[PDB]
RNA sequence: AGCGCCGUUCCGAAGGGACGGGCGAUGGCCUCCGUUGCCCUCGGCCGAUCGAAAGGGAGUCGGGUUCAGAUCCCCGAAUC
RNA sequence: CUGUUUAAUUAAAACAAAGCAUCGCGAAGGCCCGCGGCGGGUGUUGACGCGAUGUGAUUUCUGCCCAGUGCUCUGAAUGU
RNA sequence: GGCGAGCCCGAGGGGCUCUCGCUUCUGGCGCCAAGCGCCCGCCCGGCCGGGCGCGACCCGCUCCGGGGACAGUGCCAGGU
C-alpha cells in the first residue's frame, strides 16, 4: 500500500521546522577557567520570544577574559529576573535566582533547571517552560548527583556539570484552553507542521494500518510492540497497560 | 618562539613568480576589432538624416561587441572629429545603432558631405 | 641477501613481532585518509616481486576499503 | 622621578585580563602533528616485542663517536673523487703501463643486502645496524643473525648520521669487513667493547619485554591512591 | 562496482591581507618622493559560490520634439 | 459552532477542530528516511516537549468481564 | 606566600595532616605593560633610538572532560 502519515516525517521535506524567525539556540556558556575555577559578572540586557517557545530567552551579555570583547550569548529566562541584574556564573558563584552552578557545590533539594547530561553541553534537561529538577543524594567520592526530572524520573548524573538555579520563566502555559482551531493553527505555524492529525481509521484501508470499512472500526488491537516495522507503530506503541490511570506511574 | 595562539594555520610560504621558458601561442593576437571594424555602416534614412540637421549627430551601425569609448576613439581616428557623447542601442535585427553627437566646434552637415552621405 | 628474510617474516604474519607492528600501522592507516600518496613502499620485497622498482616514476599510493 | 607610577594588573579570574601565555599544550595541532605524536605515545603505552625492544636500547655517545671517528676514514668515494681515481689510473696504466698500481683496496659495505650476504659468509668483522629504520621488519632479523653467525653488532641511534659517512640520506647498515694495518687494535677495542654490551647479553635481551609505561597522570593517580593506601594501612 | 552520491561546518595546515618598524635594491626633478623583496607584529571564517526586473539598494527633474522614442533625444535647471 | 473536501454527477449527517483521554521516550533515547557512513527529519528540540492513536464544544455519567486475540512485566528455579 | 585559617608537640620554632585566592549593594570602564634589572650605536663621564628577562613560577607523554574492551562495525545462525 502507500506510504503512511507517520513515515514522512524523515524525509524533511516539508515537515521540517519553521526556524528562520527563532532568534538562537539557547545554550549556556561553554566551560572555561572562568567557570571552573571562580566566577564571571554577566548583565542580562534584554528578554525576549523565540517563536515556537513558549518559555521566555534571556540575553545575557558576558565579558572574555582573554581578549578585549563582549561575547553575548543566550539563556533561558528564569524566574524573576530582570534586565540589569548581575547574572553570574562558576563554581563558586553564590547560589541566587539565575546563577548557574554545577551540582556539586548546591545542597540537596536546590530547585533548577536547564541542567546539563554531560558535563559541558550547554543546557539539555528540564528546559521547558515552568519546569524544574530536584537535586539530591550527593556523594564525595564516586562523584554522582541524583536529579529528579519533570517526568518523574531519578537520574543519577556527574558533579561537574551546570545547572541554573530556579524554575523556568512562562509557568502554567496550559493553563488556558486553546479555545479555538484559530489559536492552535497559528501557534502551530509558529512551531512546525506537525499537524496533519487526521484519524486513522477515518483514512483509507491503504494508507493506514487501521482504517476503512463500513463502519469507522480500528478491527485490530491498537497495541502494537516495539519489534514492529516502519508503517506498523500506530495506535498505542508497546503499551503496557490502557485505560483510566490507578495512581501515578507505578514504575521502579 | 611562543605561539600565543591557539589556532595553527598555514605559514606564508614563498610563492614563485610565473617564469615561463617558451610562451605558448608564438606571437600576440591581432586586433580584430580595430577601428575599421567597429563602425560599419552609416545609417542614412529619414529619421537617421534628420539626426544631421536637427541634432549635429551623426548615426552608425556597429559590431555588437564595441562600447562607447571604442566608438568615440574610432570616430575620432577615422573621421578626425571630436565627439561630445555616443548614445548606443541594439538594433532588433542585431547589429548596434550608435548615435554619435559631435563637438559644437564641428558641423554635422560639414562631415556628412565629406563622407559622401 | 635480506628479501628472504622479509618475505619469511611477512609469511607467519600472526606472530607475536609482527601482530605488534601491524596493529600498530592499522591504527596508523586508520586515522588517515582513504587514497593518498605513500612516499616509499612498506613492504619493499612484496612491492619488489610485483614490479617496484627504486626510480623515478613509481608511485605507491596507500588506500582504504570498506570490507563487507 | 616626576610622575613615572607603577600601573599593576590583577590578573585573577573576573577581573583585568590574561595576558599573551605560552599555550603550547593547548593549540590545535594538525592531523600529521597529532599522528605522529600519538604515535610516539602508543609506542610508549603498548607492550613492544622483545625483537624491537632491541631498538632504543642503543650505543652510547662515547662510543659512537669512537665508532665514527673509525668509520670516518674508511669512507667510500663520491662520483667526484671517484671519476678522478678513475681518470688518473686510466691515464697511468696507458702511460706508464703499470701493471697492479693498486693491491688492495680498503673500503666498508653499506646496505642491508650486502652486509646480511658478509655476516652469512662470516666476511664481517664488525656490522653498524641503524635504529630509525620506519619499516622494523627490514632490520629485525639481522642482530639475531649476527648473533648467531658470531659477528659482533652495535645498534646505533640516527640513520642520518650513518648515511652522512655514505654521502646518501639512508645508510641502514655498515659492515667492517676488512682493517688497516694501524687500526687492527682500535677495531678490536670497539669489538671488545660492543660484545660485552650486544653479544654477550642476548640472551638476557631476549626475554626482556619493553614498552608497557602508562600515562604521567595515570602515573601521579595511581601514586596517589597508593599513598592514600599506605596511609590506611599506616 | 560505477556515472557519482551524502554534508555545508562537520573528521580541514580551509586568511596571500594590513597600521607600523628594521634591512637591501631599483625608478622619477635619486634634495624630495614613488615602488620591490625579506624579517617582526597584528588580523574567528560563523566558511567558496549562486539565489528577488515586487525584499534591502546613494543619486533627474520641468518644458519641447516624431508617422513610430521619452525621466533616455534637444533646451534649461540639479544631484550622487 | 466559524472552517475544509470528491477541479468535470454529491458540499453532507462526511473530514478537521478546541476539549477529554491513553501509550513510547531522560538523547549510546522515542517515532521515522536512506543503497551506503555513528549519514539525516523531529532538533536553533528536552516531559507545560516530541511522536502515535480513540472520542469529539458545555452539563451529567464513563456499568460488568483478562475466557479469547494483542500489548507489557518478571525470574538459566524451570520444558522446548 | 600569609593580607588567611587550621590539628598537635612546644622556649624560639617544628608541619604528623590539610584548606588556595586574591571579581557579590549599584544596567560605569577594563586590550595593544606600567615598573624593575641587564646588553647595544650616539653626547666625555651628559642625550636619542633599540634588543632580553622578571611582571605572567618549574616540569610533563593524550586539547580537556564523560564512557570504554562494552557499545558499534563486517559475516554467519535462530526468532519476529
Ligand atoms: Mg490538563
Ligand atoms: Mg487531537
Ligand atoms: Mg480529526
Ligand atoms: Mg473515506
Ligand atoms: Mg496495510
Ligand atoms: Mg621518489
Ligand atoms: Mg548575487
Ligand atoms: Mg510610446
Ligand atoms: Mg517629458
Ligand atoms: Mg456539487
Ligand atoms: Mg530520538
Ligand atoms: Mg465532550
Ligand atoms: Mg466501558
Ligand atoms: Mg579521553
Ligand atoms: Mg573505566
Given at each position: ?14 515537515f521540517?521546522?519553521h ?13 572555561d577557567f572562568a ?21 521566555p ?33 562558576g563554581k563558586?558563584?553564590?547560589?541566587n535566582?539565575?546563577?548557574?552552578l ?16 554531560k ?25 554522582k548527583?541524583?536529579?529528579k ?6 537520574k ?17 502555559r ?10 492552535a ?5 509558529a ?14 484501508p ?10 469507522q ?8 510492540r516495539?519489534?514492529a ?5 500506530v ?5 503496557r ?5 490507578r495512581?501515578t506511574?507505578?514504575?521502579? | ?7 595553527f594555520?598555514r605559514?606564508?610560504?614563498?610563492r ?10 608564438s606571437?600576440?593576437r591581432?586586433?580584430?576589432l580595430?577601428?575599421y571594424?567597429?563602425i ?11 539626426k544631421?540637421?536637427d541634432n ?5 551601425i556597429?559590431d ?14 577615422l ?7 555616443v548614445?548606443?542601442?541594439?538594433r ?9 553627437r ?16 | ?6 618475505q ?10 609482527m601482530?605488534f607492528?601491524?596493529?600498530?600501522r592499522?591504527?596508523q592507516?586508520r586515522?588517515?585518509?582513504?587514497l593518498?600518496?605513500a ?22 599510493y ?7 | ?8 594588573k590583577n ?13 603550547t ?25 622483545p625483537?624491537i625492544?632491541?631498538f632504543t ?9 669512537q ?11 663520491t ?9 688518473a ?5 696507458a ?5 697492479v698500481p693498486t ?6 659495505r653499506?646496505g642491508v643486502?650486502?652486509?646480511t ?14 635504529h ?10 639481522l ?12 645498534i646505533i641511534?640516527?640513520?642520518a ?13 655498515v ?9 687492527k ?13 650486544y ?11 619493553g ?22 594501612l599506616?
Amino acid at each position: 500500500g502507500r506510504v503512511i502519515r507517520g513515515q514522512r516525517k524523515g524525509a524533511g521535506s516539508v515537515f521540517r521546522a519553521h526556524v528562520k524567525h527563532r532568534k538562537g539556540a539557547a545554550r549556556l556558556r561553554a566551560v572555561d577557567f572562568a567557570e571552573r575555577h571562580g566566577y564571571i559578572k554577566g548583565i542580562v540586557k534584554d528578554i525576549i520570544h523565540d517563536p515556537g517557545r513558549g518559555a521566555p530567552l534571556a540575553k545575557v551579555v558576558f565579558r572574555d577574559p582573554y581578549r578585549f570583547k563582549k561575547r553575548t550569548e543566550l539563556f533561558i529566562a528564569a524566574e524573576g529576573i530582570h534586565t540589569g541584574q548581575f547574572v553570574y556564573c562558576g563554581k563558586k558563584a553564590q547560589l541566587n535566582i539565575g546563577n548557574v552552578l554545577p551540582v556539586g557545590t548546591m545542597p540537596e533539594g536546590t530547585i533548577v533547571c536547564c541542567l546539563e547530561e554531560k558535563p559541558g553541553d550547554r543546557g539539555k534537561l528540564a528546559r521547558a517552560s515552568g519546569n524544574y529538577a530536584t537535586v539530591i543524594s550527593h556523594n564525595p567520592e564516586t562523584k554522582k548527583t541524583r536529579v529528579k526530572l519533570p517526568s518523574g524520573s531519578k537520574k543519577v548524573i556527574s558533579s561537574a556539570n551546570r545547572a541554573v538555579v530556579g524554575v523556568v520563566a512562562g509557568g502554567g502555559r496550559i493553563d488556558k484552553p486553546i479555545l479555538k482551531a484559530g489559536r492552535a493553527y497559528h501557534k502551530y505555524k509558529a512551531k512546525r507542521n506537525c499537524w496533519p492529525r487526521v484519524r486513522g481509521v477515518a483514512m483509507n484501508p491503504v494508507e493506514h494500518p487501521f482504517g476503512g470499512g463500513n463502519h469507522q472500526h480500528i478491527g485490530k488491537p491498537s497495541t502494537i510492540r516495539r519489534d514492529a516495522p516502519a508503517g506498523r507503530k500506530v495506535g498505542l506503541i508497546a503499551a503496557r497497560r490502557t485505560g483510566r490511570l490507578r495512581g501515578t506511574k507505578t514504575v521502579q | 618562539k611562543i605561539r600565543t595562539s591557539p589556532t595553527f594555520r598555514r605559514p606564508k610560504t614563498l610563492r614563485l613568480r610565473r617564469q615561463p621558458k617558451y610562451p605558448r601561442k608564438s606571437a600576440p593576437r591581432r586586433n580584430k576589432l580595430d577601428h575599421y571594424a567597429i563602425i560599419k555602416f552609416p545609417l542614412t534614412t529619414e529619421s537617421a538624416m534628420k539626426k544631421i540637421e536637427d541634432n549635429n549627430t551623426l548615426v552608425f551601425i556597429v559590431d555588437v561587441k564595441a562600447n562607447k569609448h571604442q566608438i568615440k576613439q574610432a570616430v575620432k581616428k577615422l573621421y578626425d572629429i571630436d565627439v561630445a557623447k555616443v548614445n548606443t542601442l541594439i538594433r532588433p535585427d542585431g547589429e548596434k545603432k550608435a548615435y554619435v553627437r559631435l563637438a559644437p566646434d564641428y558641423d554635422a552637415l560639414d562631415v556628412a558631405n565629406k563622407i559622401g552621405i | 641477501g635480506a628479501y628472504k628474510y622479509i618475505q619469511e617474516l611477512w609469511r607467519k604474519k600472526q606472530s607475536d613481532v609482527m601482530r605488534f607492528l601491524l596493529r600498530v600501522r592499522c591504527w596508523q592507516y586508520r586515522q588517515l585518509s582513504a587514497l593518498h600518496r605513500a612516499p616509499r613502499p612498506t613492504r619493499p620485497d612484496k612491492a619488489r616481486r610485483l614490479g617496484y622498482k627504486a626510480k623515478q616514476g613509481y608511485v605507491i599510493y596507500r588506500i582504504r576499503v570498506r570490507r563487507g | 622621578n616626576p610622575l613615572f607610577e607603577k600601573r599593576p594588573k590583577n590578573f585573577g579570574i573576573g577581573q583585568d585580563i590574561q595576558p599573551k601565555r605560552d599555550l603550547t599544550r593547548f593549540v590545535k595541532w594538525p592531523r600529521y602533528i597529532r599522528l605522529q605524536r600519538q604515535r610516539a605515545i602508543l609506542y610508549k603505552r603498548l607492550k613492544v616485542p622483545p625483537a624491537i625492544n632491541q631498538f632504543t636500547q642503543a650505543l652510547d655517545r662515547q662510543t659512537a663517536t669512537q665508532l665514527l671517528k673509525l668509520a670516518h676514514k674508511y669512507r667510500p668515494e663520491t662520483k667526484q673523487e671517484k671519476k678522478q681515481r678513475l681518470l688518473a689510473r686510466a691515464e697511468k696504466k696507458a702511460a706508464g703501463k703499470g701493471d697492479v698500481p693498486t693491491k688492495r683496496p680498503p673500503v666498508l659495505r653499506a646496505g642491508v643486502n650486502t652486509v646480511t650476504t658478509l655476516v652469512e659468509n662470516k666476511k664481517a668483522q664488525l656490522v653498524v645496524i641503524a635504529h630509525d629504520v620506519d619499516p622494523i621488519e627490514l632490520v629485525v632479523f639481522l642482530p639475531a643473525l649476527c648473533r648467531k653467525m658470531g659477528v659482533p653488532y652495535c645498534i646505533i641511534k640516527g640513520k642520518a648520521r650513518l648515511g652522512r659517512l655514505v654521502h646518501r640520506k639512508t645508510c641502514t647498515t655498515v659492515a667492517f669487513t676488512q682493517v688497516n694495518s694501524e687500526d687492527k687494535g682500535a677495531l678490536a677495542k670497539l669489538v671488545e667493547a660492543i660484545r660485552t654490551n650486544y653479544n654477550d647479553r642476548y640472551d638476557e635481551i631476549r626475554r626482556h619485554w619493553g614498552g608497557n609505561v602508562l600515562g604521567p597522570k595515570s602515573v601521579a593517580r595511581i601514586a596517589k591512591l597508593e599513598k592514600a593506601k599506605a596511609k590506611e594501612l599506616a
